[PDB]
Amino acid sequence: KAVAFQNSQTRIIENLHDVAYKNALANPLYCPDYRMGKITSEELHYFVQNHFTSARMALVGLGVSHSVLKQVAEQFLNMRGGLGLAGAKAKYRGGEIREQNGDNLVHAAIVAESAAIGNAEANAFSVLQHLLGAGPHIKRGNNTTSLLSQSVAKGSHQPFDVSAFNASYSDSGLFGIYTISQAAAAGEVINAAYNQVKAVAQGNLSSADVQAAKNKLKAGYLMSVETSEGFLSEIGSQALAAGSYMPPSTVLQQIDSVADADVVKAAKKFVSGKKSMAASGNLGHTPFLDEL
Amino acid sequence: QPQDLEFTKLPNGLVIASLENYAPLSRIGLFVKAGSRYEDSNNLGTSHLLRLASSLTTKGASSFKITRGIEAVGGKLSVTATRENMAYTVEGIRSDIEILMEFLLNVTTAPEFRRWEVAALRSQLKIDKAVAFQNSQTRIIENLHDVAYKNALANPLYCPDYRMGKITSEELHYFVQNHFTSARMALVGLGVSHSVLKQVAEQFLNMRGGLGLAGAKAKYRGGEIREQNGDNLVHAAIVAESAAIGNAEANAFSVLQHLLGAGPHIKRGNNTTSLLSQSVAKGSHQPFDVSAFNASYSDSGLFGIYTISQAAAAGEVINAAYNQVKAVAQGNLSSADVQAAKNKLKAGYLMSVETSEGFLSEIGSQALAAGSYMPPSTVLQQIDSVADADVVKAAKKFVSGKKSMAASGNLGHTPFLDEL
Amino acid sequence: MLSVAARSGPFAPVLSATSRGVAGRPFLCRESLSGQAAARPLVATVGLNVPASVRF
Amino acid sequence: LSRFLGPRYRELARNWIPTAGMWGTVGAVGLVWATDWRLILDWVPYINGKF
Amino acid sequence: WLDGFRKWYYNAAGFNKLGLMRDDTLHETEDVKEAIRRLPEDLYNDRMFRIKRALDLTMRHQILPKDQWTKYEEDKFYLEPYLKEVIRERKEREEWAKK
Amino acid sequence: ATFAQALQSVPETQVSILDNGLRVASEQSSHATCTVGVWIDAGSRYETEKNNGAGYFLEHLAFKGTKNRPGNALEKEVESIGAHLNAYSTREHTAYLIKALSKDLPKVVELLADIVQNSSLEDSQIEKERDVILREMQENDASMQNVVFDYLHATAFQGTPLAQAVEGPSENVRRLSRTDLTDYLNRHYKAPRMVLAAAGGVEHQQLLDLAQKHLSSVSRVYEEDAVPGLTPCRFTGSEIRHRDDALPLAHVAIAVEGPGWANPDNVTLQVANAIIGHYDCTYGGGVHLSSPLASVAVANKLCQSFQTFNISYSDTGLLGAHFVCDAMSIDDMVFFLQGQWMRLCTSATESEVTRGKNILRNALVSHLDGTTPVCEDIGRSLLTYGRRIPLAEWESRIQEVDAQMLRDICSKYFYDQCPAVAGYGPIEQLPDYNRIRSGMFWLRF
């Protein structure tokens, strides 16, 4: 935990998921500070005996044929049949955890509830995520025609890093705005980014930029596809979410079927939804949910 | 005869009060309006290191001479800090009160703040934060104020771990230059003559005669923090906005606090007139402690319910307590219970009066904030002037205002603020 | 009234902190910052002989 | 020396006069008993005769 | 004439040739080591650099050339407002011990 | 004015005896509060192995049941008057305290007269309070200095009535029925072993008229003329060491038998104990603190806290030091504590004893500032000293103490004596008892 928390961003994402859910997704992915010295073998055996089930899990293979995988699945895998606890629906909470760290760069993120994986709006929210921009495409570049790094840099001469943030799960996703800046001008980058999403929620967008967002999302899915570790992760995620494989050409068709008004509806749902904020740094000029 | 306290004002700007009791104990206290709400977000924990820097060196005496002089006289030099006020207080023998007065006025007026002394003092800052966070009340009182206020009063009473190692003596000197000054300073004295205290105040307090850097206005924030601790005792408190101290709504809010059980009046009892404890104990059987607390500052105040419960029944405890305050807000009240709340508030104010450090803190806060000393009989007349409809109006204001909740423990059955 | 112990009785030691002094990479560039945000959510990898990696 | 000369160190030295003087007589009587001085042991009447 | 005799004594002492000023060649007693704890960080860092360079030069048994010798007018008395404070604090501690 | 004139101007305590022998004392001052309490001479002493938790049980139980005002009617009446109560029980005193306004004084003394005589004892409340006492006694193991003081009282006075706790053991709580508790109430709550302390806000003729009306004819004559009797308890110098190496901080106390209450030398043993002083790690004095054990402890980072105590009982006392230390410096704290103790005992100076006399004068007037601890002093002084000693006489006893006087009566009560040693925590680096005794008596003197 002390090596993995040297990244500043994962503390913000952990505090974000601690804020934006009530129960059964608000548990932190890393262990809390007090449970080290408290997690028992009976607790780990209860977690494994409830939630590691052959009816729950999947087993996927790359480079290995079907026959020895089915023989191993008949041999050592088909014993467990009790599905255990299925979660508690991940109810949305909304709020603020705003700690201070002493870094010169504030890291803030403003996020609302979005749709889940398998719905008809998660593809539109991912088109909106790549429309607002989430990737350093040209490395050490301006990241120009992304809308958030456009509309922040129209007003701010400060160094910044603004992006979109889509965290899609099977119950309810999370769509939001990520800002990293110097602490003297956090309100300018946060209000300029949120005014850019309030501009795109009124339909002020170009269909060439929607086509560039769609091509960026198709490129990002094929970036997830092209490595065999990533292909193994994509086949495992599709296997656990659906139970039948969906081909990437049909993924390109489903991304291409996202209408231009659906991401306007997604930005309207982001604006009209209840907000959630996770921020850390010097918090003198960082705005709040009343100011946003 | 103990004469009435003169509460006079110097032409320099300081509010000086002194009486002679012909007392065994001569106590002198300087009261600064330089608390945690007066320090800012850039210099945070400066009030904590300034509170621990009462035994440091100063322009006039070394720190060894300070500690050996206070111990050779026999008195004590202790500072009590709220979020709003800090209160340096030296008590001692009536013969050597001049030596105590010059040591205290050297420390409060012109500290040297040398860098090796504060570099030694940051280990004491870590030890004092660990001792004060051994108690579970102070931690969520600090995070309660962090979630209940926006910028000013949300600054913590104790220094956080991000500033530990970064507190500089230049920022300490800038904060004590901008916030230890005469027009906000009140110096009160029990057992010390007024002409002697006037002479000591004029001979050492000509320095720093401004009004000071203005503190920010605190605004209400709202929302929750809810965090996990690791014990079966879950501490959860829900507050909302109340008026500043010196207002008739705040005089109603303190008697609504003493209606709903400000603390254990009986040692090892059941507190069988507090309506919060009755309406929680009618539904719960596990050990608990439900109180209500009020904290009114100079601009804005907090009133709320503090519930200590076990982790299983805490939802029933918090919802039954909130439904009890809903019953007070609709007006299910007894006028004999309101009169018992008035007598509880009058008696608790007399408990605050009856100790000499509490009396020194009382007139130090009165001469610091208000600048005038009401008699305690006039305080009893104000509490008797507060009636039932103001209690109903303040309960409606608490149940209709935006709330903030701080919780700590095993949180599997702790209810959320939307669920209330 | 105007005090700290007169407002709340037992809560004066927890809103009044006494202290007896005596015995009784920082990413400094905008072009270098491109990549420190969160595109995709929290993914934690702990290996046997490979180090920790976070996929964002 | 200059830090060791004072009223408190003179009072501590006055407090440590009789036990250090008695330790000096312990060392003198033990030196007399170890060396068996003929001038001093001929004055004690229990060893008066020839030893 | 006294400043000329002090400059001749500074030249004959030898640490102006070797790279040290006046306050590096102090005996590390408890007062001097308390002042060692009480310097600021930059003065501490180039003081220990000057001691390490002096130890390198007396390991090599040679000195710097004359253009980079520490002059008597280029000498700063950096330790003296700390060492005088430590000496007067130790003096008042021994006077309180005598009291 | 000056200090002696000011402590002369501190008002006197008129003490008066009723028709049954009960003692009434008051200290009228300017404040409007009123702190009437009954102090009873019962405690953990004057209890056998049987009925051992009876004093703690009756301290817990005197508020819950009453003959005249049953149920929680005591709580309803005392919150109708808005007052506060307290009930502390020690080894030789139990007490009941009400702080109130002075206009509620017949209600306060009527509630005390219904508490100490007409308390009803319902068996449902006995079972409920037995469960609450067992839960509180399970919670009291975290109170580690109380555990070490109870271990020190167990190992210092073994075989005596002072070995037992005030609470009583868990095998003796579960068998306490109603008739043993009312036998304890009929034996040890007798009227001339009871004082009525008031402090300020009262009038003494009003208190004596109210004590004639309410607290007269409690109980004077025993059942079968079986008087209780105090015994001189044996001090046994011993060592108990509860070793818990997974526990973080070691609490170790070392105490020698002191003279007690009625012997006049509690002032000079207290001025030696106050020269030694106390430290906690939140004190911001640092290295420059006056007590040299605390200065050495913060100089080489020995312990977290140390507290030097003079706990006194009738002819028998424990005076010593209890320290919260780490696992690696108990040998250092024991050596420097015995070195500071017998550096005090061999080479006491006039500056050291005037520092201690000044800190004792300030500590006594800061203790007797407040109304509730000055009623604690009135009740404890009336039960132990016979009269109540005023602070002018305490100043006259303090001002006769010099360093020579301190040196010889320290040689009486410190030098070469076998102490009692208690410890809870990692007690491995405590020295063994022969090293404690070799570190007591000095190699030079």
Q: Tell me the chain F residues in contact with residue B91 when contact means C-beta distances shorter than 8 Å.
A: 362, 366
Residues B277 and B325 in one domain: yes
Q: Which residues of B touch A (CB under 8 A)?
A: 40-42, 44, 147, 150, 160, 162-163, 166, 221, 223-225, 228-230, 412, 416, 418
Which amino acid type is present at position B232?
N
Calpha distance F337→F360 (Å, rounded): 20
Q: Give the best residue of E31, E36, E38 to mutate against chain B (max B CB count within 10 A).
A: E38
Residues paired with residue F252 on neighbouring β-strands, in sequence order: F323, F423
> Which residue, among B194, B215, B177, B292, has the nearest Cα to B33 in the 3D structure?
B215
Residues B57/B220, Cβ–Cβ less than 8 Å: no
Q: How many CA atoms lie within 13 A of F43 on its CB side?
A: 23
Q: Report how far residue B383's alpha carbon sits from residue C7's, in angstroms, rounded to the nearest whole number.
A: 13
| CB-count exposure of residue B195 (10 Å: 0-12, 13-18, 19+) | exposed
Q: What was the experiment behind these coordinates? A: cryo-EM
> Are B230 and A38 in contact (CB < 8 Å)?
yes
For A52-73, give one letter per residue: b (16+ CB within 10 A) or e: eeeeeeeebeeeeeeeeeeeee
Q: Cβ neighbours of residue B160 under 8 Å, at least 6 residues apart?
A: A100, B44, B45
B330-336: long-range contacts (C-beta < 8 A, 24 or more apart)? Answer: B331/B392, B333/B259, B333/B388, B333/B391, B333/B392, B335/B388, B336/F80
F239 is catalytic: no
CA distance B77 to B102: 12
User: H-helix or E-strand containing F331?
Assistant: helix F330-346
Strand ranges for F290-369 from DSSP E = 303-312, 317-325
Q: What is the DSSP string of B267-290?
A: TT---TT-HHHHHHHTT--S--EE
Find chain F residues with C-beta within 8 A of B347's C-beta.
33, 81-84, 99-101
Nearest to C22 among F285, F363, F366 (CB): F285
Which two structure tokens, joined as six digits, stand for A58? 């999947």
CA-to-CA dists, residue B371 to B6, B183, B200, B208, B367, angstroms: 11, 11, 20, 19, 4
**What gap in Å lies between CA E97 and CA F295, rounded to an integer?**
14
CATH architecture, range F3-215: 2-Layer Sandwich (3.30)
Tokens of A25: 């997704």
Chain D residues with CB under 8 Å of a chain F CB are 8, 11-12, 15-16, 19, 23
Q: Spell out the domain ranges in chain F.
A: 3-215, 238-439
| Spatial CB neighbours of A158, under 8 Å, sequence gap ≥ 6 | A181, A182, A184, A185, A188, A189
Residue B59 shares a structural domain with residue B200: yes
Sheet holding B233-242, edge to edge: B223-224, B404-408, B233-242, B301-310, B289-296
Q: Is A215 exposed, middle or buried (0-12, 13-18, 19+ CB in 10 A)?
A: middle
Cα torsion F237, F242, F245, F250: sign: negative
Q: Supply angle C-alpha F323, F325, F331, rounded to 5.
A: 90
8-state DSSP, F315: S
What CA dihedral angle connects F4, F8, F9 and F14, to 10 degrees?
Answer: 160
Contact call for B361 and C21, based on CB within 8 A: no
DSSP strand pairing (B76-81 vs C17-20): antiparallel
Give me F36's structure tokens: 């009437």
Judged by a CB distance cut-off of 8 A, whether residue C45 touches chain B is no
**F345-F351-F357-F361 Cα dihedral, nearest 10 degrees:** -150
Pick from B116, B117, B169 the residue to mutate for testing the E interface (most E CBs within 10 Å).
Answer: B116
Tokens of F75: 């709580």
> For testing the chain A interface, which of B229, B238, B414, B418 should be mutated: the one with the most A CBs within 10 Å?
B418
Between CA B315 and CA A230 the distance in angstroms is 44
State how far the alpha carbon of D10 is from the alpha carbons of E97, F345, F347, in Å.
12, 17, 11
DSSP secondary structure of C6-28: TT-STTHHHHSEEEESS------
Whole-angstrom distance, CA of residue F436 vs CA of residue F413:
16
Q: Coil, strand or helix: which one is B121?
A: helix
DSSP state of F253: E
Nearest residue to B286 via CA among B242, B317, B321 = B317
Whole-number CA gyration radius for chain D: 18
| Interatomic CA distance for residues F425 and F11, integer angstroms | 47
Which run of H or of E encompasses B77?
strand B76-81
For residues B336 and B1, is the Cβ–Cβ distance under 8 A? no
In sequence order, the β-bridge partners of residue B86 are B32, B81
- B239 shares its domain with B205: no
* CA-closest candidate to residue F276, choices F311, F317, F307: F307
Distances (CA, A) of F183 to A45, F38, F92, F175: 56, 20, 18, 14
Which residues fall within 8 angstroms of residue D25, CB to CB, at 6 or more apart? none
Is-contact A92 A22, C-beta < 8 A? yes
Cα separation of F421 and F238, whole Å? Answer: 6
Beta-bridge mates of residue B187: B16, B30
Tokens of E34: 């308390």
Q: End-to-end CA distance of chain C, in Å?
A: 55
Distance CA F135, CA F114 (A): 28
Residue B409 and residue B377 in one domain: yes
Q: Which residues of C touch F290 (CB under 8 A)?
A: 23
CATH of domain F238-439: 3.30.830.10
Neighbours of A189 (CB within 10 A): 27
Tell the residue number behind the tokens 């030398």, with chain if given: F265
Reduced to 3 states (helix: H, G, I; strand: E, B; else coil), residue F131 is helix
Among residues F242, F253, F250, which one has the least CA distance to residue F436? F253
Last residue of a domain, one of B216, B250, B274: B216
Locate A51 and state its tokens: 């939630």
- Residue B132, Cβ density class (10 Å: 0-12 exposed, 13-18 middle, ≥19 buried): buried
Residues B208 and B286 in one domain: no
B147 and B225 in a single domain? The answer is no
Residue B177 CB neighbours (<10 A) = 13
* Alpha helices, DSSP H, located in B152-295: 169-179, 194-204, 248-259, 275-281
**Angstrom distance (rounded) from CA F310 to CA F287:** 26
List all residues 6 or more positions away from A121 whose beta carbon is below 8 Å from its beta carbon. A114, A115, A262, A265, A266, A269
Cα–Cα distance, D45 to D51 (Å, whole number): 11
On whether the CB atoms of residues F254 and F150 are closer than 8 A, the answer is no
Length of chain A (residues): 292
| Whole-number Cα distances in Å, B96 to A90, B25, E97 | 67, 11, 21
If 0-12 CB within 10 Å is exposed, 13-18 middle and 19+ buried, where does residue F442 land?
middle
Residues spanned by the domain of B309: 217-420
Chains that touch E (3 or more CB pairs under 8 A): B, D
Contact A260, A205 (CB under 8 A): yes
Say if the Cβ atoms of B116 and E93 lie within 8 Å. no
Catalytic-labelled residue, pool F12, F27, F47, F59: F59
Q: Please state, in angstroms and rounded to a whole number, the distance separating the CA atoms of residues F212 and D24.
A: 71
Q: Which residues does a chain break follow in chain D (C to N more than 2.5 Å)?
A: none
CA distance from start to end of chain B: 55
Among candidates F77, F187, F68, F56, which has minimal Cα distance to F129? F56
CA distance C18 to chain A (A): 25
Split into its structural domains, chain D has a count of 1
Tokens of F315: 């002819």
| Residue among B320, B312, B311 nearest B290 (CA) | B320
Q: How far is B266 from chain A (nearest CA, A)?
A: 35
The single residue listed with the structure tokens 């009535």 is F161
Backbone CA torsion sign across F112, F117, F118, F123? positive
Residue bearing tokens 């000369």: D5
10 Å Cβ neighbour count for B382? 14
DSSP B368: I
Strand B86-93 with F420-425, pairing: unpaired
Asked whether F230 and F148 are in contact (CB, 8 A), the reply is no
Residue of C nearest to B253 (CA): C7
d(CA F338, CA F435): 11
Q: For residue B57, give the chain E residue with the closest CA.
A: E89
Quick one: which of F109, F172, F85 has its CA closest to F372?
A: F85
Residue F48: burial class (beta carbons within 10 Å; 0-12, 13-18, 19+): exposed
B100, B75 contact by CB (below 8 A): yes
3-class DSSP state of F227:
coil
Interface of D with E (CB under 8 A): 2-3, 5-9
The Cα B54–Cα B67 span in angstroms is: 10
Which of B161, B164, B169, B178 is closest to B117 using CA atoms?
A: B169
- Structural domain including D50 reads 1-51
**At B236, is the secondary structure helix, strand, or coil?**
strand
* CA dist., res. F391 & res. F365, Å (int): 8
Q: Which two tokens stand for residue B401?
A: 């205002």
How far, in whole angstroms, is CA F110 from its chain's centroid?
27
List the beta bridge partners of residue A178. A109, A163
Place of tokens 């306060």: F108
Kindly give, in sequence order, each residue whose CB lies less than 8 Å from that of residue A132, ignoring residues fewer than 6 positions away: A146, A147, A148, A163, A164, A177, A196, A197, A200
Which residue of A lies nearest to B409 if distances are taken between CA atoms?
A: A34
Q: How far apart are CA F13 and CA F45, in angstroms?
A: 28
Is the distance from CB of A239 to CB of A58 less than 8 angstroms?
Answer: yes
Residues B83/B38, Cβ–Cβ less than 8 Å:
no
| Residues facing residue F318 across a β-bridge | F257, F311
Rounded (10°) CA dihedral A96, A97, A102, A108: -50
Verify that B134 and B228 share a domain, yes or no: no
Helical residues (DSSP H) of A133-247, grouped into ranges: 147-153, 186-200, 207-226, 228-241
For residue B253, what are its two tokens? 């809010």
| B–F CB contacts, 8 A cutoff, strictly below | 155
| F155 close to F239: Cβ distance less than 8 angstroms | yes
d(CA A78, CA B252): 68
The two tokens of residue A16 are 């974000």
